[PDB]
């Protein structure tokens, strides 16, 4: 297996002379073959906030990472890296990473406070925003890195274990692990012998693992987006025994629903970031699955739990979803997002200042969608299924709404059992 230089949402040259080094919600970095050297362009989506600029690359940077304060470049073969702050306050700086024979830099990442470099031998080199080196650590071979503030999400690959991931924090004087080389259940690409003339073979030679992008969400949860075009989010990562990867968006299914229930092969999703409940992405229209030049305006795709079935959706007919079937997905999505955000607020607190109002509205939508499933259970005379749904309600006022739905359905035995739930929650609150 050959380790290729990885960057988030980077694209291959293919049969052209230009490509994107990296790409996220801040902007995109492109490089163009210019005679014997390269022309790198750093562009931003908030044009009023940042100024696009360009510079001549005499080194052939094939690695890049972009954040809100600067841009990091890397050269996989020579080991040279350069950090370029956006603002003129601090100056650029350059460093040469030591590389053994055959050792390559496989991934770089940077935050406003941390710079991380990973190698094909598993060397994990970190610095502060000015280049002051931290301890050097030896891990499994690194294939992909992302970072947010002081936390780093690394993907590792060996021939022994396959794919693993680590989740760590780069403190003032040492690196601390939340998760160290746990299984990464991301599906690997499945390439045939007919792919040797397929138009998208160039991407998988460029990115063998098929990791289109990986990032922390805006609330700090690690995400990855592989060749199956499914957004995977790591839940409960603060509890090592409870951590799980959650598929929160089947983008192939969303493209299918956007196309009115028709199977298309010309629309593709290129992931940029996860903003709470919305996937920022580029909608790529063409033969190739990666975006080209010029870059389209970014789109927004809301996450959806993968519980919709194509056959059932066709019978109920852009695709229209029955309110009863939409309630099950909305209850599951609210349940997942509420649990994630509750863990975020109880451990890290607020970072934007309005998360509690976001969480409060979330729990409201949770009970509201749950009450709709409860009404369907009552309408179907399924008293047992309705009671189990009532147990999952959060607000005590939502238990009251369930009582009123039960009375309107004339199920007096269900009314008594729901009021027993209220009594039980009163007894537990006194202990």
């Amino acid at each position: 297996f050959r380790y290729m230089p990885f960057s988030p949402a980077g694209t291959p040259f293919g049969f052209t002379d230009r490509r994107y080094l990296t790409m996220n919600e801040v902007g995109y970095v492109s490089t163009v073959k210019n005679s014997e050297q390269y022309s790198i362009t750093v562009s931003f989506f908030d044009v009023g906030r940042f100024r696009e600029y360009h510079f001549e690359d005499l080194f052939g940077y094939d690695l890049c990472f972009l954040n809100e304060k600067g841009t990091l470049f890397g050269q996989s073969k020579t080991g040279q890296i350069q950090y370029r702050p956006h603002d003129s306050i601090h100056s650029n700086w350059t460093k040469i990473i030591p590389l053994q024979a055959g050792e390559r830099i496989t991934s770089v990442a940077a935050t406003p406070v941390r710079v991380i470099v990973g190698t094909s031998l598993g060397y994990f080199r970190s610095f502060n925003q000015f280049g002051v080196p931290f301890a050097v650590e030896k891990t499994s071979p690194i294939v992909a890195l992302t970072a947010q503030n002081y936390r780093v999400f690394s993907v590792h690959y060996s021939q022994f274990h396959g794919l693993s991931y680590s989740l760590s924090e780069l403190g003032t004087s040492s690196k601390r692990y939340y998760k160290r080389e746990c299984p990464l259940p991301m599906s690997l690409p499945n390439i045939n012998s007919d792919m040797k003339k397929d138009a998208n073979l160039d991407y998988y030679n460029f990115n063998p693992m098929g990791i289109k992008s990986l990032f922390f969400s805006s609330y700090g949860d690690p995400c990855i987006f592989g060749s199956d075009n499914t957004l995977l989010l790591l839940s409960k990562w603060r509890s090592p025994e409870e951590s799980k990867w959650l598929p929160i968006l089947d983008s192939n299914m969303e493209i299918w629903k956007m196309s009115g229930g028709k199977e298309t092969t010309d629309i593709h999703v290129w992931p940029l970031a996860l903003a709470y409940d919305t996937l920022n992405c580029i909608l790529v229209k063409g033969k190739h699955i990666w975006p080209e030049f010029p870059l389209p305006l970014p789109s927004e795709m809301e996450i959806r739990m993968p519980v919709f079935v194509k056959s059932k959706l066709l019978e109920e007919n852009e695709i229209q979803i029955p309110v009863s079937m939409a309630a099950e997905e909305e209850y599951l999505r609210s349940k997942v997002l509420s649990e994630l955000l509750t863990d975020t607020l109880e451990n890290d607190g607020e970072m934007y200042g309005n998360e509690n109002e976001v969480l409060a509205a979330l729990n409201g939508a949770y009970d509201k969608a749950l009450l709709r499933l409860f009404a369907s259970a009552c309408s179907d005379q399924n008293v047992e299924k309705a009671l189990s749904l009532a147990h999952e309600l959060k607000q005590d006022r939502a238990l009251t709404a369930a009582v009123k739905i039960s009375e309107r359905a004339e199920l007096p035995s269900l009314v008594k059992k729901i009021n027993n739930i209220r009594e039980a929650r009163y007894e537990q609150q006194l202990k």
Partner: peptide, 15 residues
């Protein structure tokens, strides 16, 4: 038997 719940849900939004 479809059950009317929209009024009960609206009452739940008010505080």
């Amino acid at each position: 038997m479809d059950i009317x719940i929209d009024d009960i849900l609206x009452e739940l939004d008010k505080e």
